[PDB]
Amino acid sequence: ASRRLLASLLRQSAQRGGGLISRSLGNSIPKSASRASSRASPKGFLLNRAVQY
């Protein structure tokens, strides 16, 4: 559950075109995914990269 996880996070967001994280968890990416918690751990890593880019 490290690095290789980001894969499933992408491969999963890819099969969906690019949703369920694009705006969802991205609704509060600046708030540190404050609008998540429940599932911001697996999406976090992918949510952190969104800010990285």
UniProtKB/Swiss-Prot annotation:
Q: Where is this region: Disordered?
A: 19-43
Span of chain positions assigned to the transit peptide in the UniProt entry = 1-53
Its subcellular locations are: Mitochondrion; Mitochondrion inner membrane
**Taxonomy, superkingdom:** Eukaryota
**Stretches with biased composition (Low complexity):** 32-41
Q: Per its database record, what is this protein's job? A: Mitochondrial membrane ATP synthase (F(1)F(0) ATP synthase or Complex V) produces ATP from ADP in the presence of a proton gradient across the membrane which is generated by electron transport complexes of the respiratory chain. F-type ATPases consist of two structural domains, F(1) - containing the extramembraneous catalytic core, and F(0) - containing the membrane proton channel, linked together by a central stalk and a peripheral stalk. During catalysis, ATP synthesis in the catalytic domain of F(1) is coupled via a rotary mechanism of the central stalk subunits to proton translocation.
Its subunit composition reads:
F-type ATPases have 2 components, CF(1) - the catalytic core - and CF(0) - the membrane proton channel. CF(1) has five subunits: alpha(3), beta(3), gamma(1), delta(1), epsilon(1). CF(0) has three main subunits: a, b and c.
Which protein family is it in? Belongs to the ATPase alpha/beta chains family.
Its name, as the record gives it, is ATP synthase subunit beta, mitochondrial
Species assigned in the record: Nicotiana plumbaginifolia
Lineage of the species this protein comes from: Eukaryota, Viridiplantae, Streptophyta, Embryophyta, Tracheophyta
Q: Which residues of the full protein are shown?
A: 2 to 54 of 560
